[PDB]
């Protein structure tokens, strides 16, 4: 006598939201927000450099812990909490900008500046930089006065970037523990270091004085830097208190840099990274870490947003 139309249904549906309603049950639904973290840095197929105890900026100046990183090459660079940019206590002026440049450099290539010195000492070391006895930053030279209290003569040294890409140049300023010990190392008077490039003009008088003992020492070195363009020249006029560059750094290409405290893993691949690990997912959104970097799902505040993939569930 009759024929009837109907549709499928379940006892229990999956609640989802619509424009009109909260928690309408549908036959099937799927998650649009990634919550699953992999607690490893997934680096399968990527030239990876894990800096460990080497600070990124240390790769440019070369304290002992960065000796194996002076000319590295990478698609992916990993900074660690234990990293340190220095041996002899100090810091870089404009540090974070330099980090950003280095994180995406693809690594660095080094080249001799070709500075020759006369009438001064170039062999200056310390117990803070240990390479079987006292040493110094591998890419730098601690310029001193020939003997104690001796005049450090007003010097001029220049370097032309004869390459097709910008050169990264770094120099230090030594701030001694006292006004006396500044005179001992470099002679008395007002020490003035000046630096000039087509993009750049600056000057540096030091400032001796007592800092608290870091690495057992109360002295500091101020590292400074500029990017020297192709065919441009940079000149160093200095009267002392100057840590001279021996080599210059050039950038290899392209990379990504991350910060993390988890292990590297060459068995999984991923393009979205954060300090707790890797987000592997095709979902358009994630609720794991808003500071995730690489190619990521968009970070959203919601734990979950279910997308209906079936009709409304209307049970018996």
């Amino acid at each position: 006598d009759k024929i009837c139309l109907g549709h499928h249904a379940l006892s229990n549906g999956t609640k989802v939201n619509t424009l009109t309603e909260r928690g309408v049950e549908v036959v099937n639904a799927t998650e649009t927000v990634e919550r699953t973290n992999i607690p490893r840095i997934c680096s399968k197929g990527k030239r990876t450099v894990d800096l460990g105890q080497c600070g990124l900026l240390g790769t440019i100046t070369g304290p002992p812990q960065c000796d194996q990183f002076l000319e590295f090459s990478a698609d992916l660079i990993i900074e660690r909490r234990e990293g340190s940019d220095v041996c002899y206590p100090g810091k870089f002026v404009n540090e974070e900008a330099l980090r950003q440049i280095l994180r995406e450099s693809g690594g660095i290539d080094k080249e001799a500046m070709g500075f020759t010195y006369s009438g001064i000492r170039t062999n200056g070391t310390t117990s803070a930089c240990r390479r079987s006895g006292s040493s110094f930053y591998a890419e730098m030279k601690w310029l001193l006065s020939n003997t104690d209290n001796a005049a450090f003569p007003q010097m001029t040294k220049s370097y032309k970037n004869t390459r097709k890409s910008p050169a990264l140049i770094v120099w230090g300023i030594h701030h001694s523990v006292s006004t006396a010990e500044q005179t001992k190392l470099y002679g008395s008077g007002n020490k003035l270091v000046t630096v000039g490039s087509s993009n750049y003009q600056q000057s540096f008088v030091p400032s001796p004085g007592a800092r608290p003992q870091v690495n057992g020492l109360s002295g500091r070195i101020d590292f400074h830097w500029l990017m020297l363009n192709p065919n441009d020249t940079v000149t160093f006029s200095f009267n002392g208190a100057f840590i001279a560059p021996d080599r210059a750094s050039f950038l290899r290409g392209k990379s990504m840099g991350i910060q993390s405290g988890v292990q590297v893993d060459a068995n999984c691949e991923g393009d979205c990274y954060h300090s707790g690990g890797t987000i592997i997912s095709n979902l358009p959104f994630q609720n794991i870490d808003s500071r995730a970097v690489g190619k990521c799902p968009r970070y959203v505040k919601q734990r979950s947003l279910l997308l209906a993939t079936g009709m409304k569930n209307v049970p018996e």
């Binding site: 109907g6 499928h8 249904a9 990504m256 505040k301 209307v314 049970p315």
Partner: protein
């Protein structure tokens, strides 16, 4: 839904219908039977999976670090950065909520739609040889055996063969 079939003039779904999404359950002299409609099930499935292929993609747009978890950046620039990131989070959290809600509305309406299209297709086949019950059933006046039901399910039911019978049975 907008078409008033699912959770509408049809009372409820069938938990026995595991073959497909939509189907026919008939009643006749030879008893009772049930079967899925492939064509409508497939239109819904294809359209839904089409939504998915669109949404389940991530962009090839790379973003890098602009701040530091180990060595805090200068406070002023740090606060601008956080404010900017928080603003963007607010935008995407909104976008995601709206996208899913409007997609879910459309999915539900589309499923309701396909059921209605199937319902109407059958009515047009059965012209004059049947009537609307009002619960999603067609009362057939002439004798329709299982062979006859299969012709309805498969778009081969010639109404003119049985027209005289069912007309008289009015």
């Amino acid at each position: 839904g907008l078409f008033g079939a699912i959770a509408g003039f049809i009372e409820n779904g069938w938990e026995g219908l595991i073959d497909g999404w939509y189907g026919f359950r008939h009643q006749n002299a030879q008893g009772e039977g049930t079967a899925a409609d492939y064509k409508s099930t497939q239109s819904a499935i294809d359209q839904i999976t089409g939504k998915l292929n669109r949404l389940i993609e991530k962009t090839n747009q790379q973003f890098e670090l602009i701040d530091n978890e180990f060595n805090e950046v200068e406070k002023q620039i740090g606060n601008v950065i956080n404010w900017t990131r928080d603003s963007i989070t607010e935008v995407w959290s909104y976008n995601a909520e709206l996208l899913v809600a409007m997609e879910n509305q459309h999915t539900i309406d589309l499923a309701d739609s396909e059921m209605d299209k199937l319902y109407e297709r059958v009515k047009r086949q059965l012209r004059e040889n049947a009537e609307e019950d009002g619960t999603g059933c067609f009362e057939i006046f002439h004798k329709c055996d299982d062979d006859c039901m299969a012709s309805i399910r498969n778009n081969t039911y010639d109404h003119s063969k049985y027209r005289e019978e069912a007309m008289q049975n009015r």
